[PDB]
Design a protein around this nucleic acid. Structure first.
Ligand SMILES: Nc1ncnc2c1ncn2[C@@H]1O[C@H](COP(=O)(O)OP(=O)(O)O)[C@@H](O)[C@H]1O
Ligand SMILES: [Mn+2]
Length: 377
DNA sequence: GTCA
DNA sequence: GTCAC
DNA sequence: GTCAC
DNA sequence: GTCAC
DNA sequence: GTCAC
């Protein structure tokens, strides 16, 4: 065993560096509960999932594969499951399996939690003896495979997650469910998430209508509207603030009232101001429209188009890339969704720019890779 | 993020 | 300093 | 309660 | 956390 | 402490 950075690593005696791997998930793939319940009642509540398993694990072992387990255990980092308790469930599990295994445990959220590919990377980079690992000559077996309800005669309930299949996808590993793999069952029906980060691009206009202009040389108030994670601050900094707009932000000032004051003062200095809040509904936007009317200046709306799933994906990406910032929770997202009212001219706007979400152009490579990965099961 |  | 938000 | 598989 | 008290 | 899930 060893305790690393948001990661656990049990390495067995007899585990040998190899250039192909056969990796599995733990719960639901190698073992299951005797209870028939999701989580283990006793710490004795576990049995091998199929009797075929140790036999196949032995063939693979001799056919040269390195044997590895990729398991999410966040209940650990969240204090719902003491490490040493779990630390030895797998030690136990290993013996009944017989074969030498290498175990990688994702204790927390972030790059290491499947479907994101951290644990895999940690293996090719640090956990072998530098010997490369052929992705296509490898394989991942997992039960979190997004299978539909009633995916087989016996099996009624839909999978709780598509995390294992998506992990495979992000890596490029061939994938199979424990039944397809161990029992030679035929591929089951399944569905992937509706939002696919791989097909997001930079193609198309930065804003609509294209006839309009992003900036104005005269004082105005620009009111952003959009989910947290829609990319408002990033866009506003790159195109408005760096050109002289005063950046007014509740996150920074503490209250809408202070935003209003600060907007008022900026207009008094003859400046152009942008309100970088979520501003989801008519009453939130009216605050700033009123300021514009009072100062006798135009008010425009930048309406950020990111969908909830796009914004959630960005939020996950922020957690992994920018930790000093506090994670927005889904509750915040669902609340925005219920509050939301489309911006319209009747509110008193001079115009409304729609700002579609467009992948960042010259994005650094290694972060493009990360951004491209499915980040939730 | 928000304080409606 | 407490309060509703 | 909001980061158990 | 800030607002209005 | 509130919210939607
Ligand atoms: N156009 C874009 N392409 C790729 N990533 C983006 C884009 N806009 C924002 N991001 C990333 O998404 C996250 C949210 O950005 P941010 O501007 O803070 O959103 P908001 O201000 O709407 O909450 C950040 O990680 C940021 O780097
Ligand atoms: Mn922001």
């Amino acid at each position: 065993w060893e305790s690393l950075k948001k990661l656990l690593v049990f390495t067995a005696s007899g585990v040998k560096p190899q250039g192909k791997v056969a990796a599995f998930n733990l719960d639901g793939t190698l073992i299951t509960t005797r209870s028939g319940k999701v989580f283990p009642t006793s710490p004795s509540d576990w049995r091998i999932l199929y009797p075929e398993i140790p036999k196949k694990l032995q063939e693979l072992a001799a056919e040269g594969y390195k044997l590895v387990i990729f398991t999410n255990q966040m209940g650990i980092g969240r204090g719902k499951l003491p490490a040493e308790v779990f630390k030895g469930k797998v030690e136990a599990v290993l013996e009944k399996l017989g074969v030498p295994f290498q175990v990688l445990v994702a204790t927390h959220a972030g790059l290491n939690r499947k479907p994101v590919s951290g644990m895999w990377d940690h293996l090719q980079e640090q956990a072998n003896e530098g010997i490369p690992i052929s992705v296509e000559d490898s394989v991942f077996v997992g039960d979190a495979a997004g299978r539909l309800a009633n995916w087989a005669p016996g099996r009624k309930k839909k999978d709780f997650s598509c995390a294992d299949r998506l992990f495979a996808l992000n890596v490029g590993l061939p994938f199979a469910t424990p039944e397809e793999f161990f029992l030679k069952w035929p591929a089951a029906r399944f569905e992937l998430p509706a939002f696919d980060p791989r097909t997001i691009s930079s193609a198309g206009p930065l804003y609509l209508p294209e006839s309009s202009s992003l900036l104005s040389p005269n004082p105005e108030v620009v009111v952003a509207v959009g989910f947290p994670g829609a990319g408002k601050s990033t866009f506003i900094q790159e195109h408005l603030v760096s050109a002289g707009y005063v950046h007014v932000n509740r996150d920074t000032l503490g209250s809408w009232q202070r935003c209003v004051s600060s907007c008022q003062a900026a207009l008094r200095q003859g400046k152009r101001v942008v309100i970088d809040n979520t501003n989801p509904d008519v009453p939130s936007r009216a605050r700033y429209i009123q300021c514009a009317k009072d100062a006798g200046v135009p008010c425009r709306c930048f309406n950020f188009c990111a969908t909830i799933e796009q914004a959630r994906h960005n939020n996950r990406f922020r957690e992994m890339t920018d930790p000093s910032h506090a994670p927005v929770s889904d509750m915040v997202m669902f609340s925005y969704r219920k509050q939301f009212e489309p911006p319209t001219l009747a509110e008193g706007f001079l115009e409304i720019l729609e700002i579609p979400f467009r992948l960042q152009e010259h994005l650094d490579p290694a972060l493009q890779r990360l951004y491209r990965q499915f980040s939730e099961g």
